[PDB]
Amino acid sequence: MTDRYSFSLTTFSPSGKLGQIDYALTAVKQGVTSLGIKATNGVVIATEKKSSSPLAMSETLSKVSLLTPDIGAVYSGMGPDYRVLVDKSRKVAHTSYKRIYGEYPPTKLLVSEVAKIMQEATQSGGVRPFGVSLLIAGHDEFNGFSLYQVDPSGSYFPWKATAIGKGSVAAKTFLEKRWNDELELEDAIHIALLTLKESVEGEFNGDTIELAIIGDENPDLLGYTGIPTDKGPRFRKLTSQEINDRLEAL
Amino acid sequence: TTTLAFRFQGGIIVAVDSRATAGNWVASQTVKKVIEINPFLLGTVAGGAADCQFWETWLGSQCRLHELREKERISVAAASKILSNLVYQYKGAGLSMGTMICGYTRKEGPTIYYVDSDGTRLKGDIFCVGSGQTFAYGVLDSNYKWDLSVEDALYLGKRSILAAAHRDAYSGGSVNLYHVTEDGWIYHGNHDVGELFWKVKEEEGSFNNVIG
Amino acid sequence: TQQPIVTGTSVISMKYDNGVIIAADNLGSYGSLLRFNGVERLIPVGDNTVVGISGDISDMQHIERLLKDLVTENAYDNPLADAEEALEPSYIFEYLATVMYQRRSKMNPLWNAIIVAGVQSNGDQFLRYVNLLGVTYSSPTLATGFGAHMANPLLRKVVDRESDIPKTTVQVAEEAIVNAMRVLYYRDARSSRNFSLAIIDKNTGLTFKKNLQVENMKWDFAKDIKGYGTQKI
Amino acid sequence: QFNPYGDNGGTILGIAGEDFAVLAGDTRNITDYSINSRYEPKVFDCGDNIVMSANGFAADGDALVKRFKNSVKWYHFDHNDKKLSINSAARNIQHLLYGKRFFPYYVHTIIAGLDEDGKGAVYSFDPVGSYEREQCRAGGAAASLIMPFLDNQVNFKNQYEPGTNGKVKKPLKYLSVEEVIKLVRDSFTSATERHIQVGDGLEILIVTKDGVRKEFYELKRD
Amino acid sequence: GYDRALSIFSPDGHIFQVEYALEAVKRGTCAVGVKGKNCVVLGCERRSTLKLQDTRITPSKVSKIDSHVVLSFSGLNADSRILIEKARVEAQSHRLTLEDPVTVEYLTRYVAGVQQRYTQSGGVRPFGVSTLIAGFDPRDDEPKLYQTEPSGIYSSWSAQTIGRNSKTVREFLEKNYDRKEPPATVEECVKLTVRSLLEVVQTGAKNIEITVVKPDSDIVALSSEEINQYVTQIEQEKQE
Amino acid sequence: GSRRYDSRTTIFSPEGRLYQVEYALESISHAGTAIGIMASDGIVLAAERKVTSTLLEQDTSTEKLYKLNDKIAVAVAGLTADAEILINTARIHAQNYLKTYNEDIPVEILVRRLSDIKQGYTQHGGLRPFGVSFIYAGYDDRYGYQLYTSNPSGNYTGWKAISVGANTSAAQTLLQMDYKDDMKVDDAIELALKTLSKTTDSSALTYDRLEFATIRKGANDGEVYQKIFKPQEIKDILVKTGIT
Amino acid sequence: NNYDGDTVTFSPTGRLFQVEYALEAIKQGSVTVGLRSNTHAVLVALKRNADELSSYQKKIIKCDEHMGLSLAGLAPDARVLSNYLRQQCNYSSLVFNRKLAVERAGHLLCDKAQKNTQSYGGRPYGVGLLIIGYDKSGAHLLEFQPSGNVTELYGTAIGARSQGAKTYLERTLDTFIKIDGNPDELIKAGVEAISQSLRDESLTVDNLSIAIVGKDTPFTIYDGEAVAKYI
Amino acid sequence: DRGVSTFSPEGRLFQVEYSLEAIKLGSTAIGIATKEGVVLGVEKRATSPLLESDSIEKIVEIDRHIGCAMSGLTADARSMIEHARTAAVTHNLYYDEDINVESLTQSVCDLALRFGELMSRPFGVALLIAGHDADDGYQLFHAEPSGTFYRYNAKAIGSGSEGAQAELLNEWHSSLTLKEAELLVLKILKQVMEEKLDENNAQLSCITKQDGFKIYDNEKTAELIKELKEKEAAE
Ligand SMILES: *[B]([O])([O])[C]([C][C]([C])[C])[N]C(=O)[C]([C]C1=[C][C]=[C][C]=[C]1)[N]C(=O)C1=[C]N=[C][C]=N1
């Protein structure tokens, strides 16, 4: 046995292209549309719950994932690759930061660690790149609210707002017209729902849409009282009912 | 054990005793404490018998490999440093060695290096090593000069071992003499202390304390 | 390095004209406590060898499994496993002797003294000793522990040298062994009355005797012994 | 604490003749104050006209002899059935012994045979591999009793010629195989009288150009 | 680990990876070595395609391995650093254990041995570098000049060149260099080295580097003006 | 077995070139142009972000200019993810040198170390090389202000003024024309921006499409200050030089 | 064709070509003959020379006092395998005080060669071996092929033109098996068997190589003027 | 591509066969064994006149009683020589004696096939190992990269090998003297060499029981060349 693939499976072609990264990006293009919008007092991330079967319980599959109490993530592309990335991202937030500094990492540095993992899959022996693009929304004390995109190459860019996947080209154009630097969180959620409706074919409701926010601290979601400095997670996943309420005022 | 080696006009004199002991028990009186590394290098042994033989025998293999690779005989400095670096790897493990690496080369001339199982490596003109070293030093220091004849230098070395063989309980048996020159070492025989003592006493007029 | 916990005492043995006898009591001691009263310390290997083991019982059980496994392994791809290529006492011993010395050399010994008794293919008697240190020796009589001090003297009165072996019958040899076992019961504080005895004869094969007892003991004279010197009543 | 060493007693003796060599050893094997065996062979024929004995801790002794016998076998395989000379065997044994420098074979080794000129040869070893060719060597428990007798009766030490009074030494005349065996037997009888670990039997191996011959003699069994 | 056999034999008995490593040397800038009676000179080409360079800090072509030995090269620049570093370490290691600086032959033998090792080790390609190693042995006034190449073979040279258009400058040296009477002085040796480079170099401005090594650890690199004086004198004599 | 699928990243062409190095350089030739200009009283680093968007958060973004220590900085050209791996290694290397010798690492030593790492990927391991070219701008008390560049081959060279990435041929010609040795930082700032403005593939050069930095002795007395320019500061210098 | 690049690849008909190519190396090798009776076992080998100045390549190797083999094919592979046997014979002696059974020695060689045919990177052994020995169940003769197949036989031959000697033994089966307590007559039958595989060249003094093992006969090799008796 | 340890359909290792082709391109080396000693001679073949020919070391000492000549990719031989020297010295350390020439050769040949995917390819060099021991006397061995070694009375390897071997076929007899063998090597070298044979482009050596292994001086060889010319012109 032994992993005898100790050589790179991603290499430069004569034209200077890294084929496997380009192909990974093509796999992301086929993936379901997901987006992110940054407001003044929060960030919103959203995507369509493309159910593979009506017998399947789409609540059990979580496209939007908590990484830290103040950082969340969503994707477009291959779901299984995303799932393992979330597992590694959650763990690296502890091992490379929280167990050292006694606090959760700021968004940009966690993103940097995720990016590193994805870069290594692009250069290390016997592996293909990850077939996903991530949108990581988060908050920290010194940088405030932020939104980052992470590609199969490991490259990451900060966005005011963006979209990835199926109808990203049209969605990004839609966001450019609507976005401004004075948006409140509720306004961003409203724009997120409008933008996402364009890329969705079938049913459009709280059960077919997954949406989470990075906003105010939620002391009700903390689980304990008695420590003033611990005020609760800024990440919150919106319920099926909470989405439908905003779809009536749409 | 008593071993000595000193530089002089006619090269180097090397002299050693022959006794080996296990506690108060005399294990051997015929031990070869000079090791012929090559036609120009000598090694004296003192302390642990096996440690000294094995590693000095081994040293000769390393010196041979040097001159095969470099098409040139090994220097006394390099030969001594191979041994000292080796024992230094084993420092703390309990090796017991006190040695002189004696030789002649064109670039160095006659050279003596004291090498030790503690890792000590010293260049010098005179050295005495072993349990009976202090007795040898007494005779050697009072009679040493640079301008000694090969004949007189040999006797001094022989006499210095005899002095120690007499007093030191763990030294004795017989005296092995070597003379190292520009053209290599020369063996000058095994001299039994049982016969050498009475010979020296009578001719030299020394040891008036003892009755004979 | 360990210390023995549950222990077995003397194993005694001797050669006779047509084979070998070996015996060992059925006790597993726990220090001064005579804890286990049904321990078999003679372990037959095939129909031509018996391994008698003293010392640590947990290590004895390990050795027991090694021998059991040795028989299995010998049978593999061996059409003559029950004939020409069957396990010999000399093979079984040398294997143990290798293991014992290897384990002592790793400073983690099997805390035992072992006597391998048997009969070879050519009818020759086999009797050899090995212990935790890997020390091996053979003799017309062999014994471990207290047996070495008390059994051997008695057994050597029967077979004092090699030339006495053909002169010693199985009845005389067995009688000497059974007597030695009684003596050990009188004088070894970590022995029991119950014991096992094995005879490996070149003609009648392996005879394994269980549930033997020390009998014909002399105790009556105890009634006359009073006090420790001056006392009369 | 586990003590990996033991003392199996016994005593061995090698003597080098002019065209022969002998290696003798008692056959008693012991622990503390008990006899294990009255006849446990201690001197072995290792092939190539070499005899060997590793006296002291028997388990290490047997291990060493076993490994040397193995070394002779592989010397034949690797070097076209060449005969292992006694001097080469001695150097090989040094490396076996010194190989376990920091966990030694607790034995006093002696080998005997013939050198490449056909003369008798005895080599003696300490536990950690220091060796030396000798005309005469006793080893083991009663070595302290026997060696002085051999210095006197083999090398004629402290012996002078009558009439001269200390001036002329006794000449070092060679000893025949019959003369050597007498000295061996008296050495062991004397050792048996004053050493409790020596007795039962004496086994002598004699090496000549014709091969390896054995001789056995009874010793006191007390 | 990556264990792939990259350097292997072909049906015609050639190791192409070693031969292609020589082609990389052929591409590299020209280097020349000339030994006089009491000196050795190492000439090196600097291609003038690269201007706006900072000549203070740019890695020099001639590298000191010890105070008495120097190494120049032709071929891949990045590869040469690995050989130089290893050589420099071995030079100090030799002084530490032998208590004597390396001979020029020994240092060459080591560098050549490293190059060879890379021609039959798994997962590695050969060095695309040929070196000229020059200097003076300790307490010795005899000049030394050695060459190595990717295959691992090495040999001593009265004079030698490597790199691009080395065929031309070797042609020049073969007719101009006399063994019975080599360049007696430093001037004569440097002059012959500059002359040989002028057959190939193009312009004699900043395209020629010269380094003179003399006995007893006496190494010095000539400046632009000093070299320019040689270039001037050569061409003025040529106009006749 | 696995041999079938091995690209063999570390081999020579018949011509004596390293395939993967050459192709990595082709990759870098499409990357945003980065320029370094060294002056007597400081160094300039200018670099063009690649086809940005209006929705890109510029003030928190960093794709071109990175800080290695207080004295040394780099401009990147190629894969950003690859560059960050090397940057973190270089940052550690500088700290190791500081811990060992209690002195800031000399620029060339740091540059050599990174260049040796890149070299390793071209000679052994069977992995693809890093598709990155650096411009190192730094200072130390030995050589003063220094500009270096390194590429995927692991070869590095020193420069007075240099460009990497796209349109380096056109960029180097313009720098070679207008550069002089007695030049100053303020003049070098202008040259850098003017060069990018002409070589850019974009319609017009604006503040949001640029990253800019200077290493000045322009700090209170004998010491060196690194200045990574903010979006508003890049906008001001573009107006000052008369480009917008 | 497309399925002979390495040992890890079955062909569409279920063949292992690298093993078959290794088998081919044996056929190119010089002829050697093996045969036994109830008391003795004999190896007879035709040694091959490079030219008239060269020596004749040795074909027989000793493994123990009671066992040895002859080789045909790559000699270095025979050295590796014979070295392995020497160790296994030796392990049996040191640990179990037991001479290794010839049948079991064949099983060990089979399993060693097999591992090389199923793993990637390695290669099959390029040599065939004829093992003879005398153990507790009498005289034995084995034929080893580098596919892994080991076979116990009364007599056999391997190498170039080995079919001639093999047919001869197949006819003589009833005669040579009965040659008990007579080593010279058993060798004669072996020398007469190998003669059937000769063309052009004949058996000379430095050409022929013979070995024998038996009841009271250690494994001994005969070369040079020692085999002139049998020419 | 294909495995390094692959067999051809004919039953040969591709890489071993290809290394043999590299050896054919190498410079000629000739060895001749006699009862008075073994002679080794080589073609130096300098690529240019500026190359100092005395630095070409294609004849090498392994021990005092064993010499060695090479042909092919001579850089590959260095690790083989180092192993040989170590084996020779190590055996002397373990057994207090000289090592047999065959045993030394066998130790070298054990390296040969230690290649796979250990080193990445076979050696591209053939060796003529000449020496003397007490058991088998004066010996000459040819060690290939296949792991095989043949003993020879005389042997030529390198570019002019088959032509030289045919010449050695006729010329060699069991009663050759050392002086006759020396001239014979020089005669055959001169025949197969491209350039004209002299003391600078050709080297001699021998191994005798008394003096051991000796490389010949250029002054000593020059006399033997002059002695050769006269004896050929004599008839
Ligand atoms: B000498 O006294 O140092 C001597 C030299 C040695 C080469 C024989 N050493 C010994 O005699 C030692 C004991 C000793 C005594 C005094 C100081 C240091 C050491 N004896 C042994 O090494 C030894 C070896 N084999 C058997 C008995 N003794």
Ligand SMILES: [Mg+2]
């Ligand atoms: Mg007694």
